[PDB]
Tab-separated table of C-alpha atoms in Angstrom:
chain	number	residue	atom	x	y	z
A	1	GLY	CA	-56.385	-11.159	48.058
A	2	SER	CA	-58.499	-11.619	44.942
A	3	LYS	CA	-61.955	-10.647	43.740
A	4	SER	CA	-63.577	-12.573	40.911
A	5	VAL	CA	-65.975	-11.526	38.144
A	6	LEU	CA	-67.469	-13.606	35.316
A	7	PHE	CA	-69.130	-11.805	32.408
A	8	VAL	CA	-71.918	-13.860	30.833
A	9	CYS	CA	-73.872	-13.436	27.605
A	10	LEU	CA	-75.629	-15.854	25.263
A	11	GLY	CA	-72.705	-16.824	23.049
A	12	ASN	CA	-69.517	-15.454	24.634
A	13	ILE	CA	-68.292	-14.116	21.289
A	14	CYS	CA	-69.521	-10.493	21.322
A	15	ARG	CA	-70.671	-8.813	24.536
A	16	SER	CA	-68.960	-10.727	27.330
A	17	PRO	CA	-65.544	-10.993	25.610
A	18	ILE	CA	-65.701	-7.202	25.353
A	19	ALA	CA	-66.821	-6.727	28.963
A	20	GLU	CA	-64.043	-9.088	30.070
A	21	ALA	CA	-61.455	-7.234	27.988
A	22	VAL	CA	-62.692	-3.814	29.115
A	23	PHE	CA	-62.607	-4.760	32.800
A	24	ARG	CA	-59.121	-6.260	32.492
A	25	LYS	CA	-57.870	-3.099	30.781
A	26	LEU	CA	-59.615	-1.023	33.446
A	27	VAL	CA	-57.951	-2.842	36.347
A	28	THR	CA	-54.617	-2.646	34.514
A	29	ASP	CA	-54.903	1.129	34.090
A	30	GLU	CA	-55.826	1.473	37.775
A	31	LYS	CA	-52.965	-0.880	38.799
A	32	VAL	CA	-55.334	-3.324	40.511
A	33	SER	CA	-55.097	-6.260	38.092
A	34	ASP	CA	-53.163	-8.316	40.654
A	35	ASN	CA	-56.326	-8.535	42.775
A	36	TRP	CA	-58.800	-9.554	40.053
A	37	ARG	CA	-59.477	-12.884	38.367
A	38	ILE	CA	-61.598	-12.157	35.294
A	39	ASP	CA	-63.300	-14.493	32.828
A	40	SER	CA	-66.296	-14.683	30.501
A	41	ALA	CA	-68.628	-17.501	29.502
A	42	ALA	CA	-71.799	-18.365	27.602
A	43	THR	CA	-75.200	-19.572	28.753
A	44	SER	CA	-75.565	-21.667	25.581
A	45	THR	CA	-73.448	-24.021	23.481
A	46	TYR	CA	-73.939	-22.233	20.138
A	47	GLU	CA	-70.538	-20.582	19.739
A	48	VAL	CA	-68.283	-22.558	22.106
A	49	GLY	CA	-64.956	-23.320	20.465
A	50	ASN	CA	-64.957	-20.039	18.478
A	51	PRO	CA	-62.859	-16.876	18.739
A	52	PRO	CA	-64.444	-13.491	19.480
A	53	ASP	CA	-66.478	-11.836	16.758
A	54	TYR	CA	-64.092	-9.975	14.473
A	55	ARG	CA	-66.153	-6.793	14.764
A	56	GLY	CA	-65.463	-7.108	18.489
A	57	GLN	CA	-61.752	-7.767	18.009
A	58	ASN	CA	-61.454	-4.762	15.699
A	59	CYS	CA	-63.455	-2.676	18.175
A	60	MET	CA	-61.016	-3.760	20.886
A	61	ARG	CA	-58.038	-2.992	18.645
A	62	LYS	CA	-59.589	0.469	18.313
A	63	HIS	CA	-59.117	1.067	22.057
A	64	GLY	CA	-55.836	-0.815	22.450
A	65	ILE	CA	-57.316	-3.845	24.210
A	66	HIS	CA	-55.470	-7.144	23.727
A	67	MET	CA	-58.618	-9.248	23.691
A	68	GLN	CA	-57.788	-12.936	24.026
A	69	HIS	CA	-60.596	-15.494	24.242
A	70	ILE	CA	-62.060	-18.803	23.137
A	71	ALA	CA	-65.789	-19.075	23.798
A	72	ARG	CA	-66.843	-21.478	26.557
A	73	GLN	CA	-70.088	-22.377	28.300
A	74	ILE	CA	-70.675	-21.463	31.928
A	75	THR	CA	-70.355	-24.425	34.313
A	76	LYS	CA	-71.513	-25.547	37.742
A	77	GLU	CA	-68.177	-24.631	39.324
A	78	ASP	CA	-68.335	-21.049	38.039
A	79	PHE	CA	-71.152	-20.399	40.530
A	80	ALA	CA	-68.664	-21.284	43.296
A	81	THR	CA	-65.367	-19.745	42.152
A	82	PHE	CA	-66.621	-16.303	41.036
A	83	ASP	CA	-67.758	-13.583	43.435
A	84	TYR	CA	-69.782	-11.731	40.778
A	85	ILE	CA	-71.587	-13.003	37.687
A	86	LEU	CA	-72.497	-10.026	35.492
A	87	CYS	CA	-74.771	-10.651	32.513
A	88	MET	CA	-76.064	-8.529	29.647
A	89	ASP	CA	-79.857	-8.904	29.407
A	90	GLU	CA	-82.874	-10.147	31.334
A	91	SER	CA	-82.727	-13.419	29.386
A	92	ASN	CA	-79.273	-14.168	30.797
A	93	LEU	CA	-80.442	-13.112	34.265
A	94	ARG	CA	-83.394	-15.492	33.909
A	95	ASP	CA	-81.285	-18.497	32.888
A	96	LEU	CA	-78.573	-17.828	35.473
A	97	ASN	CA	-81.067	-17.339	38.303
A	98	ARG	CA	-82.429	-20.776	37.380
A	99	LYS	CA	-79.068	-22.562	37.423
A	100	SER	CA	-78.089	-20.694	40.596
A	101	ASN	CA	-81.095	-22.292	42.311
A	102	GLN	CA	-79.854	-25.736	41.209
A	103	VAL	CA	-76.207	-25.857	42.314
A	104	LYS	CA	-74.207	-27.348	45.180
A	105	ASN	CA	-72.346	-24.097	45.917
A	106	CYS	CA	-73.439	-20.607	44.805
A	107	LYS	CA	-70.969	-17.962	45.946
A	108	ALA	CA	-71.640	-15.667	43.008
A	109	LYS	CA	-73.833	-12.587	42.892
A	110	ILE	CA	-75.867	-12.655	39.675
A	111	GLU	CA	-76.588	-9.162	38.362
A	112	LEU	CA	-77.063	-7.278	35.126
A	113	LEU	CA	-73.903	-5.477	34.054
A	114	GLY	CA	-76.191	-2.682	32.857
A	115	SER	CA	-77.541	-2.309	36.389
A	116	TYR	CA	-74.274	-0.448	37.107
A	117	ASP	CA	-74.553	1.966	34.163
A	118	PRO	CA	-74.674	5.572	35.453
A	119	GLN	CA	-76.780	6.355	32.377
A	120	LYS	CA	-79.248	3.681	33.600
A	121	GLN	CA	-79.227	1.871	30.230
A	122	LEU	CA	-80.249	-1.456	31.708
A	123	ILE	CA	-79.795	-3.854	28.760
A	124	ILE	CA	-76.573	-4.507	26.871
A	125	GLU	CA	-78.122	-5.836	23.670
A	126	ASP	CA	-76.522	-8.478	21.472
A	127	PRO	CA	-74.794	-6.676	18.550
A	128	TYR	CA	-74.233	-9.823	16.464
A	129	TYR	CA	-76.804	-8.789	13.839
A	130	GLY	CA	-75.640	-5.162	13.755
A	131	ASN	CA	-72.721	-3.272	12.278
A	132	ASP	CA	-69.437	-2.073	13.749
A	133	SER	CA	-71.183	0.803	15.526
A	134	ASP	CA	-73.444	-1.590	17.440
A	135	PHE	CA	-70.204	-3.017	18.841
A	136	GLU	CA	-68.840	0.398	19.831
A	137	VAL	CA	-72.143	1.041	21.623
A	138	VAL	CA	-71.635	-2.155	23.620
A	139	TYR	CA	-68.043	-1.187	24.429
A	140	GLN	CA	-69.230	2.160	25.806
A	141	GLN	CA	-71.881	0.438	27.927
A	142	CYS	CA	-69.326	-2.070	29.215
A	143	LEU	CA	-66.792	0.649	30.044
A	144	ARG	CA	-69.355	2.764	31.908
A	145	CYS	CA	-70.653	-0.225	33.875
A	146	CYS	CA	-67.183	-1.660	34.527
A	147	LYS	CA	-66.039	1.666	35.989
A	148	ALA	CA	-69.052	1.940	38.295
A	149	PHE	CA	-68.705	-1.723	39.282
A	150	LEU	CA	-65.048	-1.073	40.120
A	151	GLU	CA	-65.814	2.165	41.991
A	152	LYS	CA	-68.232	0.269	44.267
A	153	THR	CA	-65.509	-1.917	45.766
B	1	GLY	CA	-66.012	-35.327	9.721
B	2	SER	CA	-65.219	-32.725	12.356
B	3	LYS	CA	-62.436	-33.438	14.851
B	4	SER	CA	-61.460	-31.813	18.138
B	5	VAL	CA	-58.607	-31.682	20.649
B	6	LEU	CA	-58.086	-30.201	24.117
B	7	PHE	CA	-54.614	-29.228	25.346
B	8	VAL	CA	-54.279	-29.623	29.114
B	9	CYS	CA	-51.634	-28.633	31.635
B	10	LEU	CA	-51.664	-27.670	35.311
B	11	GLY	CA	-52.797	-24.044	35.156
B	12	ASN	CA	-53.519	-23.271	31.493
B	13	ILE	CA	-51.238	-20.211	31.312
B	14	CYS	CA	-48.008	-21.721	29.990
B	15	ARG	CA	-47.744	-24.906	27.927
B	16	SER	CA	-51.340	-25.638	26.930
B	17	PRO	CA	-52.224	-22.174	25.522
B	18	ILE	CA	-49.062	-22.351	23.403
B	19	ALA	CA	-49.927	-25.846	22.175
B	20	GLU	CA	-53.459	-24.587	21.529
B	21	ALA	CA	-52.382	-21.642	19.372
B	22	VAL	CA	-49.562	-23.559	17.664
B	23	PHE	CA	-52.009	-26.259	16.581
B	24	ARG	CA	-54.628	-23.701	15.555
B	25	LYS	CA	-52.054	-22.054	13.286
B	26	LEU	CA	-50.886	-25.191	11.507
B	27	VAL	CA	-54.421	-26.409	10.852
B	28	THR	CA	-55.143	-23.002	9.313
B	29	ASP	CA	-51.969	-23.395	7.251
B	30	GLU	CA	-53.249	-26.819	6.163
B	31	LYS	CA	-56.705	-25.344	5.383
B	32	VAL	CA	-58.430	-27.909	7.638
B	33	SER	CA	-59.326	-25.542	10.483
B	34	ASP	CA	-63.064	-25.653	9.732
B	35	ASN	CA	-62.974	-29.335	10.719
B	36	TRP	CA	-61.298	-28.796	14.125
B	37	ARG	CA	-62.565	-27.641	17.507
B	38	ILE	CA	-59.502	-26.540	19.467
B	39	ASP	CA	-59.131	-25.368	23.056
B	40	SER	CA	-57.045	-25.724	26.201
B	41	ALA	CA	-57.791	-26.105	29.895
B	42	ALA	CA	-56.229	-26.598	33.318
B	43	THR	CA	-56.292	-29.549	35.679
B	44	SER	CA	-56.183	-27.167	38.656
B	45	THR	CA	-58.095	-24.001	39.531
B	46	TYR	CA	-55.322	-21.727	40.807
B	47	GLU	CA	-54.694	-19.731	37.617
B	48	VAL	CA	-58.325	-19.654	36.453
B	49	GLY	CA	-59.324	-16.221	35.217
B	50	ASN	CA	-55.762	-15.308	34.198
B	51	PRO	CA	-54.382	-14.621	30.718
B	52	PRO	CA	-51.342	-16.646	29.633
B	53	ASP	CA	-47.937	-15.970	31.133
B	54	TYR	CA	-46.614	-12.835	29.458
B	55	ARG	CA	-43.375	-14.684	28.683
B	56	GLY	CA	-45.322	-17.217	26.632
B	57	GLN	CA	-47.376	-14.340	25.257
B	58	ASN	CA	-44.031	-12.947	24.076
B	59	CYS	CA	-42.852	-16.308	22.722
B	60	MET	CA	-46.019	-16.601	20.634
B	61	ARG	CA	-45.670	-12.979	19.526
B	62	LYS	CA	-42.160	-13.702	18.228
B	63	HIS	CA	-43.404	-16.579	16.032
B	64	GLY	CA	-46.367	-14.617	14.648
B	65	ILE	CA	-48.825	-16.649	16.741
B	66	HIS	CA	-52.159	-15.109	17.772
B	67	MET	CA	-52.703	-16.442	21.291
B	68	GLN	CA	-56.189	-15.586	22.590
B	69	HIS	CA	-56.934	-17.234	25.928
B	70	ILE	CA	-58.137	-16.929	29.493
B	71	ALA	CA	-57.427	-19.876	31.778
B	72	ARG	CA	-60.295	-22.269	32.499
B	73	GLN	CA	-60.568	-25.594	34.292
B	74	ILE	CA	-61.293	-28.801	32.395
B	75	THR	CA	-64.886	-29.957	32.932
B	76	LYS	CA	-66.914	-33.146	33.084
B	77	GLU	CA	-68.196	-32.334	29.604
B	78	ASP	CA	-64.740	-31.769	28.099
B	79	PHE	CA	-64.110	-35.500	28.530
B	80	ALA	CA	-67.406	-36.156	26.731
B	81	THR	CA	-67.094	-33.703	23.823
B	82	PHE	CA	-63.394	-33.681	22.894
B	83	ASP	CA	-61.941	-36.404	20.685
B	84	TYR	CA	-58.450	-35.838	22.111
B	85	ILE	CA	-56.980	-34.564	25.365
B	86	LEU	CA	-53.249	-34.020	24.852
B	87	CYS	CA	-51.447	-33.135	28.088
B	88	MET	CA	-47.882	-32.176	28.994
B	89	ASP	CA	-46.471	-34.209	31.897
B	90	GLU	CA	-47.157	-37.391	33.826
B	91	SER	CA	-48.987	-35.403	36.509
B	92	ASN	CA	-51.503	-34.094	33.974
B	93	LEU	CA	-51.789	-37.561	32.439
B	94	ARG	CA	-52.222	-39.153	35.867
B	95	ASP	CA	-54.905	-36.659	36.889
B	96	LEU	CA	-56.688	-36.852	33.532
B	97	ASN	CA	-56.779	-40.659	33.466
B	98	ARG	CA	-58.372	-40.639	36.924
B	99	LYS	CA	-61.009	-38.029	36.066
B	100	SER	CA	-61.700	-39.903	32.818
B	101	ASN	CA	-62.686	-42.996	34.819
B	102	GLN	CA	-64.928	-40.821	37.027
B	103	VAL	CA	-67.328	-39.443	34.387
B	104	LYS	CA	-70.300	-41.293	32.944
B	105	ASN	CA	-69.324	-40.651	29.303
B	106	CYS	CA	-65.707	-40.252	28.154
B	107	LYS	CA	-65.150	-39.786	24.428
B	108	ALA	CA	-61.676	-38.348	24.801
B	109	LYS	CA	-58.425	-40.154	24.062
B	110	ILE	CA	-55.944	-39.002	26.720
B	111	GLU	CA	-52.304	-38.949	25.615
B	112	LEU	CA	-49.159	-36.947	26.229
B	113	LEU	CA	-48.555	-34.349	23.536
B	114	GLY	CA	-44.880	-35.305	23.769
B	115	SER	CA	-45.638	-38.905	22.812
B	116	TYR	CA	-45.925	-37.538	19.256
B	117	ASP	CA	-42.421	-36.039	19.366
B	118	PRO	CA	-40.135	-37.345	16.588
B	119	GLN	CA	-37.279	-36.402	18.948
B	120	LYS	CA	-38.868	-38.472	21.760
B	121	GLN	CA	-38.850	-35.653	24.337
B	122	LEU	CA	-41.849	-37.248	25.996
B	123	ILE	CA	-42.420	-34.679	28.771
B	124	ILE	CA	-43.072	-30.996	28.102
B	125	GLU	CA	-41.634	-29.637	31.343
B	126	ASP	CA	-43.407	-26.756	33.040
B	127	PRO	CA	-41.540	-23.563	31.997
B	128	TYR	CA	-43.167	-21.510	34.765
B	129	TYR	CA	-40.139	-21.594	37.078
B	130	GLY	CA	-37.715	-20.578	34.310
B	131	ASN	CA	-37.008	-17.867	31.765
B	132	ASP	CA	-38.004	-16.927	28.219
B	133	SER	CA	-35.860	-19.730	26.785
B	134	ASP	CA	-37.922	-22.318	28.677
B	135	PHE	CA	-40.985	-21.124	26.754
B	136	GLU	CA	-39.106	-21.346	23.448
B	137	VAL	CA	-38.334	-24.997	24.224
B	138	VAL	CA	-42.001	-25.730	24.950
B	139	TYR	CA	-42.961	-23.994	21.702
B	140	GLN	CA	-40.539	-26.075	19.632
B	141	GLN	CA	-41.833	-29.208	21.369
B	142	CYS	CA	-45.424	-28.185	20.648
B	143	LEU	CA	-44.414	-27.464	17.047
B	144	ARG	CA	-42.874	-30.909	16.518
B	145	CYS	CA	-45.633	-32.724	18.393
B	146	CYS	CA	-48.593	-30.878	16.862
B	147	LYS	CA	-47.337	-31.458	13.314
B	148	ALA	CA	-46.829	-35.168	13.976
B	149	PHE	CA	-50.238	-35.304	15.674
B	150	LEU	CA	-52.081	-33.633	12.794
B	151	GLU	CA	-50.254	-35.991	10.429
B	152	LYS	CA	-51.647	-38.908	12.435
B	153	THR	CA	-55.157	-37.425	12.092
């Protein structure tokens, strides 16, 4: 069998590439990667066509994650092929709740990734205008949430 | 001004990610990578959410290629935004020509990547059912074809 999770942010160059990479690493360490199809996408068209933010790549290198992405925009079909859509902030939740109420098939559950954080830090905030530490913060949030999310399966 | 190309195969884990990263390298070598939007996608949905075949991931690693991809399916809007859709085999071509006539706005020129081969190896066979040498052959094909394609424009 297979479960499916799509991590969504605004641009798909900082947060969601990291969440994707952290969840893939986490299901590889647990030896469950055979049963997970994992992707990430953007709500907007700003950064489609681009690689991850280098601060994110270097943050992922720091934890031995082989991040591997080209930014893409979320589609209509993603709401049908993915069991969970996990986003970063209320703004993503707002936009995705709109498009979910305007689609021919909506299998996905649309939730905040931060809603799984044991520490209850609800928002994973865009680190694009921060420094390398803002990216490490996001990686810690993603790891905490991704572990809870996995636990509850 | 800015140009763009989409590399398409069946699942987007074997040939097309290689072609994608090969082309991305040799536009960077030519110092024209600012003027290119580069990506790859699948005709089907089976492999969506997977990283590239680890064999190909090894092939790229052996030629110093930074492959960074998760599989995605081609979309309506890919046909509208991409200047080129270069595919691998007649099945891709067949399926892409049909979808191209089924969208309201098709910018993309759909060709076989192999049609650019100076050696005239027109089909880039799927290496999925073979070994590491089958990925080396696809690489060398993508290398020939991408060069000749960039030299066209």
